[model samples]
Target: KPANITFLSINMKNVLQWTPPEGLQGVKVTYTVQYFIYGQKKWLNKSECRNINRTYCDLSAETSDYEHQYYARVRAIWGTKCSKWAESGRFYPFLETQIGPPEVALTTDEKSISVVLTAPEKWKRNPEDLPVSMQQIYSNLKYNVSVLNTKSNRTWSQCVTNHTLVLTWLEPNTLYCVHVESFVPGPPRRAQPSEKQCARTLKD
Candidate 1:
């Protein structure tokens, strides 16, 4: 049986991964995959992944509906013999998918800083497809902004629902570093924070 079968999803891009059966070291084994939408009648084959040597399969297309739950299974084949199908636990992308960091833009003034944030987009199969922001899917999306006063070495954080955040009463001629994270109001999922950005306050 395949070991440690599971789904690793990020921003709705779901991939099924598993380890080869135990004691099969150095053996050439290929795998076949199938998936079932929760409550669906039958399992469906992932034709492109059939008989593949790789242990991971991208199933974002098959499981694109973020609201829907799913299950995927794999079986290992070694010539004429095969291992029993190993299956994954039920996957709920909507709640389990990792939220990616928002795009952060910062503008500095002598005693204030203005921040603009753009939510991360969902993973699309095609480049030409309409872009969907994760914010659209989670209307209650909010951001956690962290700011550091480099001169004083102090850090403060604020949670806001709006895209623009203005930090006032900062010291003049100081440098500040900032980053933002997007999150929803439901079950806790992992948080992905934006890259740290810094700017110098204008001389007063």
Candidate 2:
């Protein structure tokens, strides 16, 4: 009579939920949850939730390292009957539904282009409400910016963490294409890059 579990991540906190085992409906039941970080060798219990009658647990702050994976398990308890632990698959925040790509805007000048980037979706949540992993990801996020001169077939790149980056020093009247990609130093280093943008420099 084991159970299965699911998770919703909000920054460093993960809200875990599960359904009761079959035939246990209307029966008085309690549950326990256990989890461990990836590469660790031990599982720990939630003292505050020990044997409590609840369907969810906030396991945020569960791991000290946001780059590591997490695994969780749950089980049901009834009078003199205990269900086997319902184990969960590995959890990776950035790889999971918890994280998404950043939003970006591009503007051009005669010899320079200004790029503005933001986490329009991720930042919609209060920072304090987000899980530790998400917080870590946002704090460390940056962009890999690349530019190609179509006429010259020359390419250049720069890495920036600021919200806005202005790239200068270009040949006037030349055609160029630019690309920006979200970069995270943590696991799953890079997500999808932005759409290609082209701008022609003003004639000198």
Cα lDDT of model 2 overall?
0.69
In candidate 1, what are the lDDT values of residues 6-92, reduced to their tens digit? 888878888899987885474788999999999879999989999998999999999888668999999988877888889899999
What is the C-alpha lDDT profile of model 2 across 1-204, one tens digit per residue?
445677776433466788878873646788888987888899988886678778888776664354788888888888767877888888875455334444557777888877676652443235666423232446776667788999999998888877787878878888888777665565553245354778788887
How high is the CA lDDT of each candidate model?
0.88, 0.69
Quick one: best TM-score, which candidate?
1
**Poorly placed runs, candidate 2 (over 4 Å):** 24-26, 100-136, 139-204
| Model 1 alpha-carbon miss at residue 88, Å | 0.3
Clashes of 2: 10
Residue pairs with backbone atoms closer than 3 Å in model 2 (clashes): 10-130, 10-131, 11-130, 11-131, 11-132, 12-130, 12-131, 12-132, 13-60, 13-131
Highest-scoring model, lDDT: 1
